[PDB]
From Swiss-Prot, chains C, D, E:
It comes from the Bacteria. Coiled coil: none annotated. Signal peptide: none annotated. The chain holds residues 50 to 322 of 323 of the full protein. This is Uncharacterized protein TP_0956.
Amino acid sequence: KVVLKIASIAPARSIWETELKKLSAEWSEITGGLVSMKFYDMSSLGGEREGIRKLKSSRPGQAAPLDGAVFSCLGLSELAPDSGIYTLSVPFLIQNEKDLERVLHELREDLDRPFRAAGFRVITWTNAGWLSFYTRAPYASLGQLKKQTIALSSLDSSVLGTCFRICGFDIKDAPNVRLAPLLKAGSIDGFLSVHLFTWATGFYRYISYALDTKICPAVIGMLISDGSWARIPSRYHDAMLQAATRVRQRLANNLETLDRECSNNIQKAGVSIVHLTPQEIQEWRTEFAADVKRIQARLPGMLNMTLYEKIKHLLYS
Amino acid sequence: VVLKIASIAPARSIWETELKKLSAEWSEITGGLVSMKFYDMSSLGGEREGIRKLKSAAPLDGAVFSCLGLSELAPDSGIYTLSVPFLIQNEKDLERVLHELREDLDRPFRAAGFRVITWTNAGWLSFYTRAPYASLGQLKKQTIALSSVLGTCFRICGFDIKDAPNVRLAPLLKAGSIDGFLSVHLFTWATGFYRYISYALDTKICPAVIGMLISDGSWARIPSRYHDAMLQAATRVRQRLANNLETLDRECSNNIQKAGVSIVHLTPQEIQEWRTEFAADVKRIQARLPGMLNMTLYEKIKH
Amino acid sequence: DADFTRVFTEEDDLDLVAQSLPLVLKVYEALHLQNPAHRGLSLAVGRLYIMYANAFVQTPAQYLPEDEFEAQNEAYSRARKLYLRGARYALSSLETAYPGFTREVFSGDEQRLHKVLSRCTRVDVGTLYWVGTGYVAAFALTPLGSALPDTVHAAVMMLERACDLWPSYQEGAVWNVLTKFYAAAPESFGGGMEKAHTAFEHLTRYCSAHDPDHHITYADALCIPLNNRAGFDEALDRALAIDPESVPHNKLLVILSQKRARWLKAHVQDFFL
Amino acid sequence: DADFTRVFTEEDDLDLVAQSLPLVLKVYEALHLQNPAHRGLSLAVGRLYIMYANAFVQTPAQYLPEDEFEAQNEAYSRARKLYLRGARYALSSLETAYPGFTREVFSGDEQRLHKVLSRCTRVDVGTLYWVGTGYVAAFALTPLGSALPDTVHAAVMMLERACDLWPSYQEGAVWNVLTKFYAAAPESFGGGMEKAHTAFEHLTRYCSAHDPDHHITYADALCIPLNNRAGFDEALDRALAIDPESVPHNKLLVILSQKRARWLKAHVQDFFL
Amino acid sequence: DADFTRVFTEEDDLDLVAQSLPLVLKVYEALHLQNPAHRGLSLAVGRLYIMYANAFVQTPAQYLPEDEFEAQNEAYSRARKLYLRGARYALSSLETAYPGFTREVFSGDEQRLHKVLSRCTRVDVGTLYWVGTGYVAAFALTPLGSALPDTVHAAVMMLERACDLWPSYQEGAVWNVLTKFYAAAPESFGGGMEKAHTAFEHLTRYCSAHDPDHHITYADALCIPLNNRAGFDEALDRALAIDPESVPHNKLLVILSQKRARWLKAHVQDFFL
């Protein structure tokens, strides 16, 4: 009986959880009872960083307490810093779900490579949600938005908050908690999030506008230690690796359906929804593209130019 | 591997029960590999139409045919040879034939590209009549309704056979347009037609044989091993069926008794005496038709 | 009476129902045997059995794997017995109202038969549907040859008779039972397909668009034996398209029918070529 | 009536209970629909559903193999529905006593809400626990999208409100439910671990040493997310140490809790590295 | 009672009964705890438990495969507990009528035991049978010690005592329980085969030819341990030869015994060389 303990950032009653659980079941039935996945809450392990620690050992040849994990870009990069995975979060680089679906598919090897060399197999990729800006006032232009004080939740642990502040944004570090107090206090104009959070938590009350134009994906992030994967026999591999690829796909669909209903509820609730003009979308990309350099000095690597252009060459040709 | 098989087995029949038990017994032999899904032959529009559907990756791989379907498939047998009156009258006697003469029966069908999973009996012909008959020619003189084509050669033996649907029977009887009809005890009791006739023949005349074959091609889909095992399971079937059909024919002929019908039993004399009246028509049934009457299989059965 | 039975018909949780009914049958049954001449009780307990036999005995047995068919035959034998018990409890309501009735209608003399049936009024229509449906259901589960053609005849006459008095009764509930019967029995038996399509049109007159039953009855009884796969799918689809949350009552009967439709859709394989 | 639930609370044979409750739910429910304005009945039937949902639906589904999870998801959806029905039945007791109450509480206006709850007296505390607990249980079974933010917050307010009126109620039963909630919900949601440990100390004030619940609640809600394996084991041990025969009262809830503790002890593997 | 239990004893559908009884046990039990001094209720609920333990718990467990034996041991432990509960409910009828009774009989002082038993009239015979039978059945589900539990000896005295007052009671029901006991217990225990054949002859005096029980009791209790295969078969045959449709009452008990006889016939190999 081969049992795979996998750490997960998937939120509780969430549909990423439902889907991981369906995969553990789909895998179990493929292997006739052989393989199952037991999931462990990443917050309980004390963060992705801490979780990576539980993948190692203690000693070589001795089994890690953990045979895998679902990491966000944060955990991914701590595991393989030559990866260049944060490259997909480049604003307006990939804005579309089909477009990102195109990338995770065709560029797979180029993505998997850094991680295979850290001794991991990437079972599948998927998306945490699409960044949006929730704000108390509107913005007729980008620089107008960079001028607004905008709080991040993780922030200092997440490199994309530090490089946002490098693009000219005023980004203030706040816990999920001091958000409602800070807004009414006028200490913040708004915050970065995903539609799901902003609806589910009920923070929509406290802001007047929400951005519906897709900017860039938060990618995750499921890997199993090379050593634990070798414990499953031979045969089943192909079969179960396709099962997870299937997952990415239902996930892509439902995340979309979900992001859509959320952006609906917030509508009905009196928030007004902002939609970027095809013009502006072009116009903004070029304002960020100009923001490259001061990143590479503060966060070298972090962008793989090869990988940049494989991606560019596809989506726009 | 799933085997779609067409069936002439009547709804709650016990031939149905038994096919279903065989599908289950086969499934358990193969560990879940093989199952049989059954398709109502009336729904496919008749045995003829069902034969059509074994053709095309063919959609039907098998069927339970009566002599009618059997002969359309392989007009070599001759399959109708067993229905020669008084040739086989006994269930053990017919059990003896389906067993020992198996190869000789299976042959015509193996050459049409089929394997015969098993043979069995639809029921024993009887004559249900409003008046009695002290002799055969007396009966041939009675107007007697049918409807398959086993009836065209009855009309060739000197019987007055009128073509009627199962439906116009009750009207036709009370109208005096018919003296009685051909059937099996099960039908005559189950439908409640016993009411409308005074006498019923209990002396066995001849079997209606069926009739279960699977396409040579679909049989090759089951692996080598299981074959012997499951072909014996079906042979077992023929046997329970032989027993129960008897038990059933017996209770039916009982209920009709209680109901006021009186039951006619041919004296051992008459049985001999009748056979020789048909044998004189039998040489005449080959003259009028080739095919359906085979004559080697036939002379062999005598033996 | 019916303020109680509401908590059943409106329930969407099937197990709650399956577990709580048997003691209710037992209670009604007891009450009946205590006041046999009370017609309402007679019918109530008869209908209850017939209903339970269908939903909680016969139906579950249809979802059973084909290799387990011994279990399934036991189930059907069980349901058969229960359909009959129900029919008799209901029939006692008629015998209480019209003494001699059981003797006559089952005498299988056409004159004494319709004679006794002619004495019936719209009051008795409810009882006629349940007695008829009870026996007809049992027939469907009876081994060929063990039926008693007089009896089947009687049941079907009672139903055709409720039809005379009250064609609209229960949104054409009687038509639905007849459609199913006519479709199955051979014309020698008094069935046939012309007879069945006829009975179905009548169903459509009085039936609800919010009722999944007729759609199913159509696919099951008619479409299958006519080898019409199209209508089969389309009809089952129309059934599964009804929101159980949007219906007036019999949320329960809706859930049940939709369960059956889904099974039918998935087993379409076994019904067509 | 309350002498009647005695034969359930004191029972140690689980199956007897599991098989006999559904008709009881059905009976109470019926009585309720008959006299909707009768507040005791309202609460009674609501509490019954909430309790059955937990013991006979949600709990059994936790013991299910992980490959069977479709069945388990159906169970959870079932339990959710039942928790909700219960909560409403209990909520009607409040709406009967304070008309408009349902409207005000779910209005999702922090003032209107602070007003209607202030109208409540110790009489209503019983009703508040059950309405709150009902909704909170359903939330735990509700998919992140579908959770409905004003609603949840109403339930939790109702519970914090019973806490104001009657901190000792049912040996701190309300504290136990809150502990479980606070520990689960993010502080964005109004939860958090500081808030949860706080609610637990209060539990300890009024709870029985012969009650296995708090010990379980401790290991389950607190110890796990804090990755404390020690206290987890020690607490489950303290629970399994109670002789069910030494507190005849609450014997059933004790047997059930001890069953759950054993399962937890065996699955410790799945909760820690 | 009276007219109510009729719908159970006369039933041939076992599952209807199995599913409906538990809430009836629960209801009688409740009523009892409400009016403890009501002797009829006391006995009724006790007898019900004893009867349910036998038919719906112990019996089913006997038909279990030999490798599943853990499940079967749980079953037996369960039935044991229920037999005992029944015995006590019935015993309370005695204690209500003759205060101190429980103290005296169970003291296991031969002088006190027989003394309080002398106080009993034919009225109490019914209660004696059930208290005795309850404890005796539980004993059979216990492993075998050195000497005899004082409760069981008291039990057997209570039975022999009902025999003094009323040898014909319930067509010699008491004799049948004794026969089974005497045959099983060693003479050190107060049993033995001479004692058992004697008790059986008496059974034959008052028992019905239409009752399958004694026939089975004969094969089971006597024939087996005497390695008589002939009588075994012959007796079981005599039992299976009874038409349950021809028996006035306890159709149910007949169906159940015939089920058991068939199983015994099929397992004949396990009891003989």
